[PDB]
Write an enzyme that holds these catalytic residues in place. Structure first.
Site, mmCIF file in Angstrom:
data_model
loop_
_atom_site.group_PDB
_atom_site.id
_atom_site.type_symbol
_atom_site.label_atom_id
_atom_site.label_comp_id
_atom_site.label_asym_id
_atom_site.label_seq_id
_atom_site.Cartn_x
_atom_site.Cartn_y
_atom_site.Cartn_z
ATOM 1 N N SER A 42 0.783 -1.234 0.000
ATOM 2 C CA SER A 42 0.000 0.000 0.000
ATOM 3 C C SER A 42 0.828 1.304 0.000
ATOM 4 O O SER A 42 0.255 2.395 -0.018
ATOM 5 C CB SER A 42 -1.001 0.004 1.152
ATOM 6 O OG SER A 42 -0.347 0.295 2.366
ATOM 7 N N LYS A 45 0.348 3.885 -2.698
ATOM 8 C CA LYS A 45 -0.496 5.075 -2.567
ATOM 9 C C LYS A 45 0.297 6.375 -2.449
ATOM 10 O O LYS A 45 -0.222 7.435 -2.711
ATOM 11 C CB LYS A 45 -1.455 4.928 -1.390
ATOM 12 C CG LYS A 45 -2.505 3.834 -1.565
ATOM 13 C CD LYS A 45 -3.677 4.081 -0.615
ATOM 14 C CE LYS A 45 -4.479 2.823 -0.403
ATOM 15 N NZ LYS A 45 -5.917 3.154 -0.256
ATOM 16 N N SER A 102 -7.316 0.513 4.528
ATOM 17 C CA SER A 102 -7.849 0.160 3.211
ATOM 18 C C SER A 102 -8.197 1.401 2.397
ATOM 19 O O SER A 102 -7.301 2.060 1.863
ATOM 20 C CB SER A 102 -9.071 -0.755 3.343
ATOM 21 O OG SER A 102 -8.673 -2.022 3.834
HETATM 22 HG HG LIG Z 1 -5.387 6.510 -3.220
#
Ligand SMILES: [Hg+2]
Length: 347
Positions: A42, A45, A102
């Protein structure tokens, strides 16, 4: 003597790879397997955020604009966390998905909104990878879930952190928000280091999957000094934040960042033959930041040499005419081009 010139040992860091850089000078203070390709998960991001912040700097949309939730967002019913398809959510709320565990539906909906489709957004992500000169990064999706073909490295992830702080400051400031509204609901930032009182942490992004392990890119300041760390493939829950804390603490204790010369300030003045004036004004065209062993500020020496023996007109603005040498114990630690600060035309 030996206590002045000492090279500090690097602490034991319980992760597969790590890097510590000074944000202003770009200096690497410590590194281990920093170029090894790893699944960023992640932390993806971070790049997504970069592209979004570039969009918002270019005025393509604003905090107050409304986004329609597509079946895109849904395809990646009793949970209040998920965005309902066909509902309308302000940009201000979606773009906070960076602070969440998330929030991938928000992430996808923003990608469509900004770039028309997911694939075109990934296209922008990967172009920005090239524009920053990153050698070990490639993305497949906006969120990093569904594509362990994607890779990055500690160094590259640190350099993305750097570009975030430098290029898109308004987007970077979202990262230190402790509490924020997501989908009409109160949510907490996942970066626990934000609550640490021994450090001023204001970023960046934390993540964990079983394949990738614990990953964190952090940034902290002490005075006018800013460090970035990336720790990847951290091995235990226990160390998820402590390991990076150890790195940052170490860098502040043993190094300082000094700014000996600012752009447009006269470093030196030299005779000019055959000119409008008889005096050249010399300095740099880029700010000078040096990272040195802490406490050695006053033993730092600057001197210069010219490329020739005299300066003849004409001289252009920002014309390189020599070299500035920076020195610690008569060792050259940095060199910069010495430039003319003011046009000097012929007599
Ligand atoms: Hg994003």
């Amino acid at each position: 003597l030996n206590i002045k010139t000492m090279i500090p040992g690097v602490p034991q860091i319980d992760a597969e790879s790590y890097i510590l850089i000074d944000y202003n000078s770009g200096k690497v203070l410590a590194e281990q397997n920093a170029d090894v390709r790893r699944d960023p998960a992640s932390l993806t991001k971070m790049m997504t955020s970069y592209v979004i912040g570039q969009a918002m700097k270019a005025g393509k949309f604003k905090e107050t604009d409304l986004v329609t939730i597509g079946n895109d967002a849904w395809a990646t019913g009793s949970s209040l966390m998920f965005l309902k398809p066909g509902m309308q959510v302000p940009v201000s709320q979606l773009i906070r998905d960076i602070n969440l565990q998330s929030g991938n539906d928000a992430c996808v909906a923003m990608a469509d909104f900004a770039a028309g489709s997911q694939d075109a957004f990934v296209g922008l992500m990967n172009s920005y990878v090239n524009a920053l000169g990153l050698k070990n990064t490639h993305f497949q999706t906006v969120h990093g879930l569904d594509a362990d073909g994607q890779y990055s490295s500690a160094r590259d992830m640190a350099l993305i952190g750097q570009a975030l702080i430098r290029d898109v400051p308004n987007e970077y400031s979202i990262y230190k928000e402790k509490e924020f509204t997501f989908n009409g609901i109160r949510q907490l930032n996942r970066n626990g280091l934000l609550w640490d009182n021994s450090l001023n942490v204001d970023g960046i992004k934390t993540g964990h999957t079983d394949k990738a392990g614990y990953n964190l890119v952090a940034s902290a300041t002490e005075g006018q000094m800013r460090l970035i760390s990336a720790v990847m493939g951290g091995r235990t829950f226990k160390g998820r934040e402590a390991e990076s804390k150890k790195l940052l603490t170490w860098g502040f204790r043993f190094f300082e960042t000094v700014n000996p010369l600012k752009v447009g300030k006269e470093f030196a003045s030299e005779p000019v033959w055959f000119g409008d004036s008889d005096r050249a004004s010399l300095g740099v065209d880029k700010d000078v930041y040096l990272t040195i062993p802490r406490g050695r500020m006053k033993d730092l020496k600057a001197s210069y040499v010219l490329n020739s023996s005299e300066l003849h007109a004409p001289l252009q603005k920002n014309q390189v005419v020599g070299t500035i040498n920076f020195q610690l114990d008569g060792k050259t630690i940095e060199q910069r081009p010495l430039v003319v600060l003011q046009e000097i035309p012929e007599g």
